[PDB]
RNA sequence: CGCGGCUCUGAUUAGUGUUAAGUCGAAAUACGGUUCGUGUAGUGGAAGUUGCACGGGACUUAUCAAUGUUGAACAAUACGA
């Protein structure tokens, strides 16, 4: 069965300094990751996914419509742990290599800050904001910001559930609305018939998530309160998060090829 | 003296044993060229042969017109003689 694993630096015991109280991280990871794994176990208790890993269940249950409920619990457990696994007990100084690509791609580290934080609030819904690394066979490494919805995964092997654009406020009769609507059916029709829209490289090496931001309410509603009056809330939660990012590890997983 | 038993003999007559170098057929052993044998009743130079029922110690010697299957798609980081 799938069991809960400890956190990075005993966050469950002490928690982050000025980002999450030990009681909040307890309700956010222990009392929730355990709840998700209990449901995940019941769904794979007697199937081939019984001994498979979370990410393996994600890629294997991405397109199958009869396993969408299994994808949620598997993808949620993977995304949730991916969030806490990149937090540092003490602020870290951004490396030189990473500090270069961020400025070359987004213009400035402060610009990337507002883009991710701005996307978290602009999304108005529980999800995850990713910092993806895209590198086509001919093009160089390029960093962008991808925002997934409730349990969507950023990996290319699970593009079937790359839930990054709501349909209730993005598909309409307006000029931009019709464009989104066309792309909607173009994906559903292409995916259904098996055709691929964007050619990808083998092994899903195109997109490599490096950083994540969990915007679900169970992670900040208790600590930063609702947010009425401009104090705390989902806004301050995203701001304080930006200070505890493990830029040392973020740069590592990025694997920015040295060319300077 | 009679009857019975026993022994020997008897014109004439039957059977069987032995005997490589004769004669006439070819009945059996192979589907032995009419399946062979048992019983019973006939028949023919001889072995044979005929009827009727019976036995296998003769047919288990037996070896597909059911003609033999798209038994749940494809693609993925799954899969890799
Ligand atoms: Mg005499
Ligand atoms: Mg005869
Ligand atoms: Mg004869
Ligand atoms: Mg005969
Ligand atoms: Mg006879
Ligand atoms: Mg006659
Ligand atoms: Mg015979
Ligand atoms: Mg015989």
Describe the fold and architecture.
This protein has 260 residues and is mainly alpha-helical. It is 44% helix and 7% strand. It is built from 9 helices and 3 strands. It has helices at residues 22-44, 54-60, 68-84, 96-106, 109-123, 175-193, 217-220, 233-243, 247-254, and strands spanning 128-134, 142-148, 211-214. Strands 2-1-3 form a 3-stranded antiparallel β-sheet, with helices on both faces. Strand 1 (128-134) and strand 2 (142-148) form a beta hairpin. Helix 1 (22-44) runs antiparallel to helix 3, helix 2 crosses helix 3 (68-84) and helix 5 (109-123) runs antiparallel to helix 8. It is globular, with a radius of gyration of 19 Å. The termini are far apart. The chain binds magnesium ion (8 copies). The structure holds one RNA strand of 81 nucleotides.
